[PDB]
């Protein structure tokens, strides 16, 4: 049985309620956030609030494929969020391609693939992004990058492959949208690879379950929550608002 | 806002529904299980089915405190489950005391304490049990021990410290009961230590949110689910059944 989790629509409702009642928390800079602790939902839409930027996600994908820990290797102009989090030499931790494809992180993708190809029912089919040393590594050379994704586990049931995504922190507006596109990409790729290994498998992509320690919206995005609360629209221009 | 999760009572219901419907899965030996994938619930009871063995949990606690990776150092006679999972020299991976207190695993407890003592609002107060090299370490020297707990995050909100437990696999009967006792112990200790750091803090233990990739019952325990399904009693002797 796959758990009876909330949907993205229900998450929207709870975030609206949180704002309606001034359930604010003071983030590490000093800025307000609304927040759901221990959030768990099926990622059945590719965004919660805001709009889809397919161009950006594709650049972030190409960067993950390079497995480069330097933010300058992001195609084109490096986003400001990535450069203010980088070290003095432009280095970070959270290249998710490095996490699952580098041999430096013990070949997470390949090992999970080998595991599920040998035992489709495995409960140890898992990709481990973070590491114990992250307690010291997150601010190496003055970066500020404590890996937000901990683990992603894959479970094959009824010829559908489900992903259980475990994060410590995920921003509702930018974070979820980019990270969902990534996890959906990796899920689709794992299905293809397993199917190409044996044509009788016929696996299909299943559910992505999103587990977040702190799922939050920053105060600069409150107008999106507010507008949805009043109109049901998941996006406005900050000008039209 | 702390998420509106299922309770242990609701988990019991769903597990009963799964058995009622022969929703079985063939485990790695070859034995049936019922199962909830992507389970998330508030651990508001110290067990799901079965009875509390305080004597055993105390022996396992003492072993965790020793941080010993050898199963023979478990006080008294080593449980059969522990010795069939051990390597050829009696070694394992899953001493949770080693995981959070050993300097070999980068001082998970101490670093999380320092983090939360410095910033009570932190989203990076976290203890990382598992490691990337677990892909290769799980069967070192012929052991069979792929760490079941991935991470545990701590979030202090309204002077209550909530724990978000992320596991890939947890057996409903023996697993949850022992592991909950452990996580409750660590939560209580972290509250104490933070409170002893500053008398104006006045923190309290909050909720333990349990996230499991595969939450399962083995076929040898089906009779407990079956009995609860009929009578509402969470325990019977296999003789009285």
DSSP 8-state assignment for residue B104: G
Which residues of A are less than 8 Å from B136 in CB distance?
Answer: 106, 111
DSSP state of A238: T
Chain B contact set for A3 (CB, 8 A) = 14, 36-40
**Count of H helices and E strands in chain B?**
8, 6
Test A213 with B38 for CB contact under 8 angstroms: no
User: A40 and B207: CB-CB below 8 Å?
Assistant: no
SS3 assignment, position A104: helix
In chain A, residues with a C-beta closer than 8 Å to the C-beta of B130 are 128, 151
Q: Which residues touch B149 (CB under 8 Å, ≥6 apart)?
A: B94, B96, B99, B129, B130, B165, B166, B167, B179
Experimental method: X-ray
Q: Cα separations (Å) of A19 from A74, A174, A210, A221, B1? A: 35, 18, 22, 11, 10
Residue B203 structural domain: 1-241
Chain CA centroid to CA B231, Å: 27
Q: 3-state DSSP call for residue A95?
A: coil
Alpha-carbon distance of B164 to B183, in angstroms, equals 10
Q: State how far the alpha carbon of A12 is from the alpha carbons of A15, A19, A37, B127, in Å.
A: 5, 11, 14, 29
Picking from A239, A158, A233, A170, the residue whose alpha carbon sits closest to that of residue B153 is A170
Q: Give the C-alpha separation, A80 to B67, whole Å.
A: 44
Cβ atoms A211, A39 nearer than 8 A: yes
With beta carbons less than 8 A apart as the criterion, state whether A64 and A95 touch.
Answer: yes
DSSP string, B185-232: HHHHHHHHHHHHH-TT---EEEEEEEEEEEEEEEGGGHHHHHHHHHH-
Beta-carbon separation of A132 and B134 below 8 A:
no
CB-based contacts of A193, cutoff 8 Å, min separation 6: A113
Question: Which secondary-structure segment (H or E) carries B169?
Answer: strand B160-171
Query: Quick one: CA dihedral B84, B89, B92, B96, positive or negative?
Result: positive
Cβ-nearest to A164 among B17, B27, B213: B213
Put residue B158 in one of left, alpha, beta given phi > 0 → left and psi -120 to 50 → alpha: left
Any idea which residue has 């990622």 for tokens? A43
**Radius of gyration for chain B, computed over Cα atoms and rounded to the nearest angstrom:** 19
Please, which residues bridge with residue A235 across strands? none
Phi and psi angles of residue A38, each rounded to the nearest 5 degrees, phi first: 60, 35
B112-120 contact pairs (CB < 8 A, 24+): B112/A135, B112/B154, B112/B190, B113/B190, B113/B193, B113/B194, B116/B154, B116/B156, B116/B161, B116/B190, B116/B194, B117/B194, B117/B197, B117/B198, B119/A28, B120/B156, B120/B201
Q: What phi, psi does B155 have (nearest 5°)?
A: -130, 120
- Selecting among A34, A148, A156, A187, the annotated active-site residue is A148
CATH of the domain at B73: 3.30.572.10
- Nearest Cα neighbor of B164 from A165, A39, A154, A202 is A39
The shortest CB-CB distance from A107 to any of B26, B119, B135 is to B135
**Cα–Cα distance between A113 and A115 in angstroms, integer?**
5
Main-chain phi, psi angles of A55, to 5 degrees: -70, -45
How far, in Å, are A15, A39, B79 from residue B48 at the CA level?
31, 22, 21
- What's the domain count of chain B? 1
User: Would you put residue A202 in left (φ > 0), alpha (ψ -120 to 50) or beta?
Assistant: left
**Are B126 and A168 a contacting pair at CB < 8 A?**
yes
Cβ atoms of A188 and A160 closer than 8 Å: no
DSSP string, A170-233: EETTTHHHHHHHHHHHHHHHHHHHHHHH-TT---EEEEEEEEEEEEEEEGGGHHHHHHHHHH--
Contact assignment for B135 to A128 by CB distance below 8 Å: yes
Q: Which residues contact A82 (CB under 8 A, 6 or more apart)?
A: A71, A74, A92
**Between chains, do A169 and B25 touch, taking CB under 8 Å as contact?**
no
Token pair recorded at residue B240: 């009285």
Question: Residue A234 corresponds to which tokens in the numbers above?
Answer: 């998941």
Distance CA A151, CA B147 (A): 12
Cα–Cα distances in angstroms (integers) from residue A120 to residues A114, A125, B181, in the given order = 10, 9, 32
Residue B79: exposure state from Cβ atoms within 10 A (0-12, 13-18, ≥19): middle
Residues of B with CB below 8 A from A135's CB? 106-108, 111-112, 128
Q: How far is CA A183 from CA A59, A128, A187, A188, in A?
A: 15, 13, 6, 9
Residues from chain B that touch A107, judged by Cβ atoms under 8 A, are 135
Compute the distance between CA of residue B24 and CA of residue B43 in angstroms, rounded to an integer.
24
Q: Which residues make beta-bridge pairs with A166? A: A151, A211
The count of residues in chain B is: 241
CB pair distance less than 8 Å for B209 and A134: no
Return d(Cα B100, Cα B106) in angstroms, integer.
8
* Overall size of chain A counted in residues: 241
Q: What is the C-alpha to C-alpha distance for residues A140 and A92, in angstroms, rounded to an integer?
A: 9
Cβ-nearest to B108 among A39, A135, A207: A135
Report the alpha-carbon distance of residue A176 to residue B40 in Å, rounded. 19
Active site residue B148: yes
Q: How far apart are CA B176 and CA A34, in angstroms?
A: 31
Choose, from B36, B74, B113, B148, the residue flagged as catalytic: B148
Longest dimension (CA), chain A: 55
Count Cβ–Cβ pairs < 8 Å, chain A vs chain B. 172
CB nearest B150 (choices: A1, A4, A166): A166
C-alpha–C-alpha distance, residues A209 and A179, integer Å: 12
């Amino acid at each position: 049985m796959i758990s009876d989790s909330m949907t993205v629509e229900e998450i929207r409702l709870h975030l609206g309620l949180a704002l309606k009642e001034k359930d604010f928390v003071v983030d590490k800079t000093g800025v307000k956030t609304i927040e759901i602790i221990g959030a768990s939902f099926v990622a059945d839409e590719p965004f919660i609030f805001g709009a889809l930027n397919d161009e950006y996600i594709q650049r972030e994908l190409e960067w993950y494929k390079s497995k480069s820990l330097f933010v300058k290797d992001i195609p084109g102009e490096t986003p400001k969020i990535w450069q203010q989090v980088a070290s003095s030499k432009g280095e970070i931790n959270s290249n998710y391609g490095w996490a699952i494809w580098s041999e430096d992180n013990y070949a997470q993708y390949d090992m999970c693939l080998a595991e599920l190809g040998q035992n489709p029912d495995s409960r140890r089919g898992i990709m481990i992004y973070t590491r114990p040393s992250m307690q010291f590594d997150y601010n190496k050379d003055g970066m500020s990058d404590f890996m937000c994704t901990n683990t992603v586990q894959y479970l094959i049931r009824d010829k559908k492959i489900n992903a259980v995504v475990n994060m410590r922190s995920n921003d509702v507006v930018f974070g979820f949208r980019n990270d969902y596109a990534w996890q959906k990409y990796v899920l689709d790729k794992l299905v293809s690879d397993l199917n190409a290994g044996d044509s009788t498998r016929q696996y299909k992509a299943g559910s992505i379950i999103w587990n977040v320690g702190s799922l939050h919206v920053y105060s600069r995005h409150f107008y999106l929550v507010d507008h949805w609360w009043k109109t049901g629209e998941t996006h406005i221009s900050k000008k039209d608002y």
